[PDB]
Amino acid sequence: VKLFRASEPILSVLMWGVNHTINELSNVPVPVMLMPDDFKAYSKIKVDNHLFNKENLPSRFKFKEYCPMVFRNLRERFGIDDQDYQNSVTRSAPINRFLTTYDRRFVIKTVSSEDVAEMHNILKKYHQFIVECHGNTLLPQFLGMYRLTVDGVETYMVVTRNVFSHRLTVHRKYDLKVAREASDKEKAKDLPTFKDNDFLNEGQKLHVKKNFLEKLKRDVEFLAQLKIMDYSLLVGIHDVDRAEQFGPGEFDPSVDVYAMKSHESSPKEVYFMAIIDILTPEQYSKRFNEFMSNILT
Amino acid sequence: VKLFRASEPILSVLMWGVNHTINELSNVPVPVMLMPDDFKAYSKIKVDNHLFNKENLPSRFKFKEYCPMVFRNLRERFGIDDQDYQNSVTRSAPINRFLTTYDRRFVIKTVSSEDVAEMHNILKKYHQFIVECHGNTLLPQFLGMYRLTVDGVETYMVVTRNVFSHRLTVHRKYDLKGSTVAREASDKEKAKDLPTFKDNDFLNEGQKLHVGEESKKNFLEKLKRDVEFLAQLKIMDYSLLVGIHDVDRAEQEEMEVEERAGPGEFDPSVDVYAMKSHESSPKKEVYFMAIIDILVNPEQYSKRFNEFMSNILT
Ligand SMILES: Nc1nc2c(ncn2[C@@H]2O[C@H](COP(=O)(O)OP(=O)(O)NP(=O)(O)O)[C@@H](O)[C@H]2O)c(=O)[nH]1
Ligand SMILES: Nc1nc2c(ncn2[C@@H]2O[C@H](COP(=O)(O)OP(=O)(O)NP(=O)(O)O)[C@@H](O)[C@H]2O)c(=O)[nH]1
Ligand SMILES: Nc1nc2c(ncn2[C@@H]2O[C@H](COP(=O)(O)OP(=O)(O)NP(=O)(O)O)[C@@H](O)[C@H]2O)c(=O)[nH]1
């Protein structure tokens, strides 16, 4: 029994919504191919519940799913089963807009109307690229896109596969791309988002490189051709020994897709690296490219 | 994998709605008791799809379920499981508004806004009656009440358990009121396959139903409390629907079926209104007898009704 028990009405509606659209989809046949209209398509449902089942859900709310055929195909191509996705969102309220499913597999980010517009703008080529690279990429894996109406307020969400391990604690993270670096207050946060300079003058490398670089180049090239910028490479680091204070450094490469073991010859950790934030050319790409090509040793 | 394929979009939407509402209710816990708000409550869903899932469902439709907590409970008290209900409605399209589920277990009747209003008016009392009578009644067993919206047009529907068997074939039928006013069937109706014979038609044939005392007493006691309950509310024009199954004829028809390619028994948990003919009647038969259409004065209407049905059978 999924009650859609959550800290805020909006989370409840998200849970309800994912549950609903995925059951509905299970009634929709898997087609031989995506079609042009699938990229211009949506489902919309409006709920108006008088004196009923408003123990957790708002009595009145809307839920809209952009291009459900496309995002179900992306799901399949990312090796993700519809039932597991549904369970991750619904079996328990997602946790604290930036959200994570209770099991930490999927990230739910609140986004703008123009982010949604832009996603629609890249979606065909992005899909074709996921096809052509066989879901082997560092780009965000987009799993679903929704608009929620709650108390008259529209909210937009995008679901991605988590960059980080859904199990291995991340001990230090960097957001790589002038010059930028972490603030005098952000550096006082539990897990700080460090930047390029904090990384450079700290003299850190990542002993691992072939796959990562081939992949990364192909990706940032694709992002260039779409005239997109501002995207960052998210890097996460889990210190095995630090955890050691069901084995340490143990993970499922088919789940934690971006995870990477430290090379046998190293001062032992787990790295997670993936490109985030591309919903916004050449120079940015080659600059980004070279900066990241110099972290792997 | 339910496609909701149907010859009319109204039916697809019916299937989708029962499916959707039953699954939703599966998330809703079963209460210790029903509350007053449960009798004034409704669920409403409005769907506007664009360029998506249009092979069977229309892109735009509305579905409303009346007092769903109540009807769920009613289903429980009539020994009908929600998954079975759902399956009966959605596994395959209902068939010919007067519909029957593909498996013949449930009747879907198209009604009026007036009808829906009267359901609400009588619902708390009908519920309590079903409670204190333990589900043992000739009255319609109400299982669900819905409003569909297709093409800006609104359609109300009431679901009941079939009075007739979901398996056994009905070879003759009567709609009986007991009116002093003459009630026969038209040449039109009499030319139909299974005509709806009426009062004077029943009188004319010297027709009688022999069920034996122990079944007669049960029947008549049900009937007496039923029409007394109906008389209490301002309820009139309701009928006794009478189906007659010829066991022998059926064995014959089956035989013609197996040739061109058990006997007179039934599950009373399922064919709730079925009665075997008396161990020593002429031809052996099964009858189905229920009160239908409950949505001069009511008291006398029920005296006039009860005397006629009381004489309908020995
Ligand atoms: N655990 C986890 N955290 C993430 C993931 N993606 C982003 N984050 C974190 O959430 C924040 C959101 O970053 P971003 O997508 O750039 O959103 P933004 O608001 O446009 N940028 P900013 O970080 O400056 O606010 C980042 O600081 C990052 O640390 C993820 O997949 N998993
Ligand atoms: N006694 C009673 N009648 C009710 C109740 N709910 C609905 N009705 C009656 O049932 C009839 C059908 O109502 P319905 O078609 O749902 O629509 P509506 O409530 O009129 N408004 P709308 O058509 O805008 O949805 C109406 O005549 C209404 O008065 C209730 O709780 N109690
Ligand atoms: N198989 C079956 N037929 C039923 C059932 N209830 C009613 N009918 C039939 O369906 C028709 C309509 O019955 P009724 O409820 O009186 O509807 P109505 O609209 O009030 N009357 P009518 O349609 O005859 O003018 C009749 O042919 C009746 O015999 C039922 O449970 N099962």
The domains of chain A are located at: 1-162, 163-296
How far is the first Cα of chain B from the last one, in angstroms, to the nearest whole number?
50
Nearest CA to B93 among B17, B15, B30?
Answer: B15
Rounded to 10 deg, the angle between the A210-225 and A282-293 helix axes is 170
Give the binding-site residues of ligand 2, using a 6 Å CB cut-off. B 40, 113, 116-117, 120-121, 147
- Cβ-Cβ contacts under 8 Å between A and B: the total is 74
What does the DSSP assignment read for B143-167? EEEEEEEETTEEEEEEEEE-SS-SS
- Sheet with A42-48, side-by-side order of all strands: A98-100, A106-111, A153-161, A142-150, A60-66, A42-48, B42-48, B60-66, B142-150, B153-161, B106-111, B98-100
Q: Indicate the helix (H) or strand (E) that contains B188.
A: helix B187-190
* Interchain proximity A53–B43, CB inside 8 Å: yes
Phi and psi angles of residue A173, each rounded to the nearest 5 degrees, phi first: -125, 145
Distances (CA, A) of B70 to A230, B97, B143: 56, 25, 9
Q: CA A242, CA B60: separation in Å to the nearest integer?
A: 56
- Left if phi > 0, otherwise alpha if psi is -120 to 50, otherwise beta: which for B178? left
Distances (CA, A) of A104 to A88, A95, A165: 8, 8, 8
Compute and round to an integer the Cα radius of gyration of chain B: 21
Structure tokens at A10: 């909006």
Nearest CA to B283 among B263, B259, B262, B255?
Answer: B263
Contact criterion met (CB below 8 Å) for B133 and B225: yes
Structure tokens at B151: 């093409």
Contact criterion met (CB below 8 Å) for B183 and B199: yes
Q: B114 alpha carbon to ligand 2 midpoint, in Å? A: 9
Picking from B27, B30, B39, B149 by the largest number of A CB atoms within 10 A of its own CB, the best residue to mutate is B27
Q: CA B286, CA B163: separation in Å to the nearest integer?
A: 12
Residues in chain A closer than 8 A to B53 (CB atoms): 24, 28, 43
Q: Indicate the helix (H) or strand (E) that contains B274.
A: strand B274-276
Say whether B140 sits in a helix, a strand or coil.
coil
Contact criterion met (CB below 8 Å) for A147 and A46: no
Q: CA A196, CA A177: separation in Å to the nearest integer?
A: 7
Distances (CA, A) of B148 to A48, B60, B205: 15, 11, 43
Report the CATH number of the B163-313 domain: 3.30.810.10
Residue where the block lists tokens 């809209």: A64
Picking from A13, A52, A72 by the largest number of B CB atoms within 10 A of its own CB, the best residue to mutate is A52
Contact criterion met (CB below 8 Å) for B105 and B88: yes
CA of A36: which chain B residue's CA is closest?
A: B51
For B173, which DSSP code?
Answer: E
Q: Which of B88, B96, B97, B98 to mutate to test the pocket of ligand 3 (most atoms within 8 A of CB)?
A: B98
Nearest CA to A144 among A56, A236, A7, A25?
Answer: A25
Q: Which residues contact B291 (CB under 8 A, 6 or more apart)?
A: B138, B139, B140, B223, B226, B227, B230, B238, B239, B240, B241
Amino acid at B260: R
Q: CA B148, CA B260: separation in Å to the nearest integer?
A: 42
For B36, which DSSP code?
Answer: G
Q: Give the CA count within 13 Å in the CB-facing half-sphere of B302.
A: 19
Q: CA B304, CA B176: separation in Å to the nearest integer?
A: 11
Distances (CA, A) of A258 to A105, A163, A212, A254, A269: 12, 6, 10, 9, 14
Nearest CA to B164 among B287, B303, B20?
Answer: B287
Asked if B188 has any chain A CB less than 8 Å from its own CB, the reply is no
Longest Cα–Cα distance of chain A, Å, equals: 65
For B276, which DSSP code?
Answer: E
Phi and psi angles of residue B138, each rounded to the nearest 5 degrees, phi first: -80, -10
For B39, which DSSP code?
Answer: G
Q: Which residues contact A82 (CB under 8 A, 6 or more apart)?
A: A22, A25, A26, A72, A75
Q: Which of B44, B71, B115, B116 to mutate to test the pocket of ligand 2 (most atoms within 8 A of CB)?
A: B116
Q: CA A284, CA A182: separation in Å to the nearest integer?
A: 21
* Alpha helices (runs of H) in B3-112, residue ranges in sequence order: 9-27, 68-77, 82-90
Rounded to 10 deg, the angle between the B113-132 and B68-77 helix axes is 40
Q: CA B194, CA B54: separation in Å to the nearest integer?
A: 38
Distances (CA, A) of A265 to A76, A171, A262, B307: 37, 21, 8, 100
Residues in chain B closer than 8 A to A40 (CB atoms): 50-51
How far does CA B278 lie from the centroid of its chain? 26
Q: CA A180, CA A186: separation in Å to the nearest integer?
A: 13
Nearest CA to B178 among B119, B234, B227?
Answer: B227
Q: CA B65, CA A171: separation in Å to the nearest integer?
A: 52
Asked if B113 has any chain A CB less than 8 Å from its own CB, the reply is no
Distances (CA, A) of A38 to A3, A85, A262, B220, B278: 31, 21, 42, 62, 65
Quote the Cα angle for B192-B193-B198, to 5°: 65
Asked if B50 has any chain A CB less than 8 Å from its own CB, the reply is yes
Contact criterion met (CB below 8 Å) for A222 and A129: yes
- Sheet with A193-194, side-by-side order of all strands: A193-194, A172-176, A232-239, A269-276, A259-261
How far is the first Cα of chain A from the last one, in angstroms, to the nearest whole number?
50
Q: B116 alpha carbon to ligand 2 midpoint, in Å? A: 7
**Ligand 3 atom closest to residue B170's alpha carbon, by position in its atom list:** 1
* Interchain proximity A38–B24, CB inside 8 Å: no
Q: Which of B109, B174, B186, B270 to mutate to test the pocket of ligand 3 (most atoms within 8 A of CB)?
A: B109
Q: CA B157, CA B145: separation in Å to the nearest integer?
A: 6
By what method was this entry solved? X-ray
Amino acid at A226: L
Residue ID of nearest Cα to ligand 1 atom 9: A98
Nearest CA to A182 among A166, A199, A170?
Answer: A199
Q: CA B110, CA B147: separation in Å to the nearest integer?
A: 10
B256-265 burial, b at 16+ Cβ within 10 Å, e below that, comes to eeeeeeeebe
Q: CA B106, CA B161: separation in Å to the nearest integer?
A: 5
Binding residue per annotation — A161?
yes
Q: What was the resolution (in A) of this experimentally determined structure? A: 2.6
Q: Give the CA count within 13 Å in the CB-facing half-sphere of A36.
A: 0
Structure tokens at B254: 């089956």
Q: Which residues contact A231 (CB under 8 A, 6 or more apart)?
A: A220, A223, A275, A276, A277, A278, A280, A288
CA of A55: which chain B residue's CA is closest?
A: B28
Q: CA B305, CA B310: separation in Å to the nearest integer?
A: 8
To the query of whether residue A217 is one of the catalytic residues in this protein, the response is: no
3-state secondary structure chain A: CCCCCCCCHHHHHHHHHHHHHHHHHHCCCCCCCCCHHHHHCEEEEEEECECCCCCCCCCEEEEEEECHHHHHHHHHHCCCCHHHHHHHHHCCCCECCEEECCCCCEEEEEECHHHHHHHHHHHHHHHHHHHHCCCCCCCCCEEEEEEEEECCEEEEEEEEECCCCCCCCCCEEEEECCCCCCCCCHHHCCCCEECHHHHHCCCCCECCCHHHHHHHHHHHHHHHHCCCCCCEEEEEEEEHHHHHCCCCCCCCCCCCCCEEECCCCCCCEEEEEEEECCCCCHHHHHHHHHHHHCCEC
Q: Give the CA count within 13 Å in the CB-facing half-sphere of B289.
A: 23
Structure tokens at B199: 């009062």
Asked if A24 has any chain B CB less than 8 Å from its own CB, the reply is yes
Question: Check: CATH 3.30.810.10 for A163-296?
Answer: yes
Contact criterion met (CB below 8 Å) for B202 and B249: no
Q: B107 alpha carbon to ligand 3 midpoint, in Å? A: 9
Amino acid at A113: S
Contact criterion met (CB below 8 Å) for A163 and A231: no
CATH topology of domain A1-162: Phosphatidylinositol Phosphate Kinase II Beta (3.30.800)
Asked if B41 has any chain A CB less than 8 Å from its own CB, the reply is yes
Q: CA A71, CA A126: separation in Å to the nearest integer?
A: 11
Say whether B65 sits in a helix, a strand or coil.
strand
Q: B113 alpha carbon to ligand 2 midpoint, in Å? A: 7
Q: Give the CA count within 13 Å in the CB-facing half-sphere of A57.
A: 27
